[PDB]
Design an enzyme around this catalytic site. Structure first.
Site: not given
Length: 129
Positions: A50, A52, A59
């Site tokens: 992922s 941010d 996120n």
């Protein structure tokens, strides 16, 4: 956009974050500091792949859509790129959903590790609010 400390405190206050769920303003300013160093454009990749985004490093695993994070949600219902605007509205809105999700600001590991149990009101010291 890179904010001044008091510039961010005042925008965050305008947007309703001073004491949102009991988290005084200094908590939000301390979080921004150690997430993004007050830079709306900050991006960082997580180990799980992922990413941010923005002033509060929100996120893409749960909160926004970046088009590239398999097996993820978009609970704030926005493009992650919206979190990088010089206008902090979407970041703020989405952080209010995050901080109401049951873990409070513990959702931000950097708040937990850097701000929690400190004199956070030092982050709004000398500020015109």
């Amino acid at each position: 956009k890179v904010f001044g400390r008091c510039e961010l405190a005042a925008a965050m206050k305008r947007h309703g974050l001073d004491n949102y769920r009991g988290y005084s303003l200094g908590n939000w300013v301390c979080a921004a500091k150690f997430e993004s160093n007050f830079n709306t454009q900050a991006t960082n990749r997580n180990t799980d792949g992922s990413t941010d985004y923005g002033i509060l490093q929100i996120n893409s695993r749960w909160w926004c859509n970046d088009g590239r994070t398999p097996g993820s949600r978009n609970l704030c219902n926005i493009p992650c790129s919206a979190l990088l605007s010089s206008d902090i509205t979407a970041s703020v809105n989405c952080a209010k959903k995050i901080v109401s999700d049951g873990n409070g600001m513990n959702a931000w590991v950097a708040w937990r590790n850097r701000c929690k149990g400190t004199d956070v009101q030092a982050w709004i010291r000398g500020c015109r609010l």
